[PDB]
Motif scaffolding. Structure first.
Motif, mmCIF file in Angstrom:
data_model
loop_
_atom_site.group_PDB
_atom_site.id
_atom_site.type_symbol
_atom_site.label_atom_id
_atom_site.label_comp_id
_atom_site.label_asym_id
_atom_site.label_seq_id
_atom_site.Cartn_x
_atom_site.Cartn_y
_atom_site.Cartn_z
ATOM 1 N N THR A 75 -1.574 12.218 -3.689
ATOM 2 C CA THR A 75 -2.899 11.551 -4.409
ATOM 3 C C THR A 75 -1.891 10.180 -4.958
ATOM 4 O OG1 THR A 75 -4.450 12.792 -3.453
ATOM 5 C CG2 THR A 75 -4.891 10.812 -5.250
ATOM 6 N N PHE A 76 -2.003 8.998 -4.177
ATOM 7 C CA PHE A 76 -1.174 7.909 -5.047
ATOM 8 C C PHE A 76 -2.478 7.358 -5.985
ATOM 9 C CE2 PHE A 76 1.874 8.549 -1.852
ATOM 10 C CZ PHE A 76 3.179 8.550 -2.125
ATOM 11 N N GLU A 77 -2.327 7.838 -7.430
ATOM 12 C CA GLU A 77 -3.368 7.260 -8.253
ATOM 13 C C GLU A 77 -2.914 8.136 -9.389
ATOM 14 O OE1 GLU A 77 -8.276 7.580 -5.913
ATOM 15 O OE2 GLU A 77 -7.007 9.090 -7.766
ATOM 16 N N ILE A 78 -2.920 7.393 -10.184
ATOM 17 C CA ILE A 78 -2.600 7.682 -12.195
ATOM 18 C C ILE A 78 -3.884 8.778 -11.802
ATOM 19 C CG2 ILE A 78 -2.973 6.937 -14.293
ATOM 20 C CD1 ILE A 78 -2.450 4.062 -13.476
ATOM 21 N N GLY A 79 -2.536 10.079 -12.993
ATOM 22 C CA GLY A 79 -3.319 10.676 -13.263
ATOM 23 C C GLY A 79 -3.023 12.181 -12.631
ATOM 24 N N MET A 112 1.080 -1.328 -0.268
ATOM 25 C CA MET A 112 0.254 0.157 0.447
ATOM 26 C C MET A 112 1.167 0.962 0.084
ATOM 27 S SD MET A 112 -2.837 -0.199 2.744
ATOM 28 C CE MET A 112 -3.714 0.350 2.735
ATOM 29 N N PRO A 113 0.546 1.918 -0.725
ATOM 30 C CA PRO A 113 1.133 3.264 -0.967
ATOM 31 C C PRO A 113 1.096 4.026 0.771
ATOM 32 C CG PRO A 113 -0.201 3.807 -2.557
ATOM 33 C CD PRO A 113 -0.548 2.016 -1.672
ATOM 34 N N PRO A 114 2.277 4.677 0.868
ATOM 35 C CA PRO A 114 2.420 5.607 2.001
ATOM 36 C C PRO A 114 1.552 6.586 2.456
ATOM 37 C CG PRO A 114 4.358 5.926 0.881
ATOM 38 C CD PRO A 114 3.761 4.983 -0.011
ATOM 39 N N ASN A 115 1.525 7.507 3.461
ATOM 40 C CA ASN A 115 0.798 8.184 3.648
ATOM 41 C C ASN A 115 1.476 9.577 3.581
ATOM 42 O OD1 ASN A 115 -2.152 9.280 4.635
ATOM 43 N ND2 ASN A 115 -1.129 10.117 5.985
ATOM 44 N N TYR A 163 2.910 -1.835 -7.588
ATOM 45 C CA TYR A 163 2.569 -2.080 -6.509
ATOM 46 C C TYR A 163 3.622 -2.725 -5.524
ATOM 47 C CZ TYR A 163 -1.428 0.610 -6.974
ATOM 48 O OH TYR A 163 -2.719 1.883 -7.852
ATOM 49 N N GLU A 164 4.105 -3.635 -6.192
ATOM 50 C CA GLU A 164 4.727 -4.919 -5.544
ATOM 51 C C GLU A 164 6.206 -4.302 -4.904
ATOM 52 O OE1 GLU A 164 1.843 -5.640 -6.998
ATOM 53 O OE2 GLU A 164 2.634 -5.306 -8.912
ATOM 54 N N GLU A 165 6.810 -2.608 -5.636
ATOM 55 C CA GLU A 165 8.596 -2.492 -5.759
ATOM 56 C C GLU A 165 8.265 -0.846 -4.695
ATOM 57 O OE1 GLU A 165 10.040 -4.311 -9.609
ATOM 58 O OE2 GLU A 165 11.347 -2.604 -9.230
ATOM 59 N N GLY A 166 6.856 -0.744 -4.981
ATOM 60 C CA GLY A 166 6.855 0.066 -4.391
ATOM 61 C C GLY A 166 6.804 1.476 -5.232
ATOM 62 N N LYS A 167 6.964 1.704 -6.317
ATOM 63 C CA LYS A 167 8.157 3.127 -7.332
ATOM 64 C C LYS A 167 5.980 3.243 -8.123
ATOM 65 C CE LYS A 167 10.212 -0.381 -10.347
ATOM 66 N NZ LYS A 167 11.428 -0.391 -10.870
ATOM 67 N N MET A 168 6.399 4.824 -8.954
ATOM 68 C CA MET A 168 5.458 5.348 -9.773
ATOM 69 C C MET A 168 6.409 5.930 -11.048
ATOM 70 S SD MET A 168 3.659 7.367 -7.385
ATOM 71 C CE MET A 168 4.230 8.799 -6.949
ATOM 72 N N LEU A 169 5.649 5.529 -12.255
ATOM 73 C CA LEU A 169 6.063 6.034 -13.146
ATOM 74 C C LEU A 169 5.874 7.828 -12.744
ATOM 75 C CD1 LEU A 169 8.078 6.020 -15.653
ATOM 76 C CD2 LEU A 169 5.645 5.174 -17.121
ATOM 77 N N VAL A 170 6.288 8.568 -13.308
ATOM 78 C CA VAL A 170 6.209 10.610 -13.535
ATOM 79 C C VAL A 170 6.826 10.609 -14.326
ATOM 80 C CG1 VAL A 170 6.737 12.492 -11.805
ATOM 81 C CG2 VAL A 170 6.541 9.460 -10.701
ATOM 82 N N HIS A 171 5.478 11.516 -15.064
ATOM 83 C CA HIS A 171 5.441 12.166 -15.924
ATOM 84 C C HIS A 171 6.053 13.635 -16.035
ATOM 85 C CE1 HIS A 171 5.318 13.960 -20.376
ATOM 86 N NE2 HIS A 171 4.237 14.544 -19.535
ATOM 87 N N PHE A 172 7.403 14.567 -16.635
ATOM 88 C CA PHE A 172 7.108 15.854 -16.132
ATOM 89 C C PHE A 172 6.156 16.534 -17.447
ATOM 90 C CE2 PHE A 172 11.001 15.401 -13.399
ATOM 91 C CZ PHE A 172 11.348 14.282 -13.798
ATOM 92 N N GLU A 173 5.124 17.691 -16.815
ATOM 93 C CA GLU A 173 4.743 18.622 -17.068
ATOM 94 C C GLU A 173 5.697 18.888 -18.862
ATOM 95 O OE1 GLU A 173 1.725 22.010 -16.311
ATOM 96 O OE2 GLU A 173 1.410 20.584 -15.477
ATOM 97 N N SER A 180 4.365 17.506 -11.768
ATOM 98 C CA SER A 180 4.828 16.360 -13.094
ATOM 99 C C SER A 180 3.151 15.425 -12.932
ATOM 100 C CB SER A 180 6.237 15.594 -12.002
ATOM 101 O OG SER A 180 6.900 15.855 -12.403
ATOM 102 N N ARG A 181 3.226 14.656 -13.143
ATOM 103 C CA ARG A 181 1.988 14.022 -13.016
ATOM 104 C C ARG A 181 2.778 11.963 -12.767
ATOM 105 N NH1 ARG A 181 0.219 14.583 -19.049
ATOM 106 N NH2 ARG A 181 0.352 11.936 -19.547
ATOM 107 N N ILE A 182 1.512 11.755 -12.355
ATOM 108 C CA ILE A 182 2.176 9.665 -11.905
ATOM 109 C C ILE A 182 1.215 9.146 -13.378
ATOM 110 C CG2 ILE A 182 0.971 7.899 -10.651
ATOM 111 C CD1 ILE A 182 0.456 9.655 -8.159
ATOM 112 N N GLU A 183 1.648 8.373 -13.788
ATOM 113 C CA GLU A 183 1.319 7.628 -14.864
ATOM 114 C C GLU A 183 1.474 6.200 -14.514
ATOM 115 O OE1 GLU A 183 1.830 10.830 -17.903
ATOM 116 O OE2 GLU A 183 1.870 8.064 -18.846
ATOM 117 N N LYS A 184 2.050 4.924 -14.249
ATOM 118 C CA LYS A 184 1.242 4.137 -13.716
ATOM 119 C C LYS A 184 1.710 3.893 -12.215
ATOM 120 C CE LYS A 184 -0.048 3.091 -17.724
ATOM 121 N NZ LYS A 184 -1.323 3.038 -18.201
ATOM 122 N N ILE A 185 1.511 2.750 -11.827
ATOM 123 C CA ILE A 185 2.182 2.569 -10.107
ATOM 124 C C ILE A 185 2.947 1.388 -10.668
ATOM 125 C CG2 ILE A 185 1.153 2.316 -7.480
ATOM 126 C CD1 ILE A 185 -0.593 5.023 -8.404
#
Length: 67
Positions: free
Chosen positions: A10-14, A2-5, A36-46, A29-34
């Motif tokens: 907000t740990f959601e796509i978009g 589960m994503p940390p607090n 959950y197994e490795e605890g990381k996300m793909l970040v896109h720079f505006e 930036s915005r979240i592209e993908k998550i």
């Protein structure tokens, strides 16, 4: 699994946040993908090419809320 607090992120796509970029500047930036197994996300720079999209662990101090 589960994503940390992290109030203000907000740990959601978009969802939006700021990421510390290659010039040591906080950049919108915005979240592209998550991953959950490795605890990381793909970040896109505006407005940047998607070649620069970056996987960043979700507790990273290179992420912060977009005020």
């Amino acid at each position: 699994h589960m994503p940390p607090n992290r109030p203000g992120i907000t740990f959601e796509i978009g969802a939006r946040l700021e990421a510390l970029d290659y010039l040591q500047k906080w950049y919108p930036s915005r979240i592209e993908k998550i991953d959950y197994e490795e605890g990381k996300m793909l970040v896109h720079f505006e407005r940047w090419s998607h070649r620069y999209d970056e996987w960043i662990y979700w507790d990273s101090n290179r992420l912060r809320p977009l005020e």
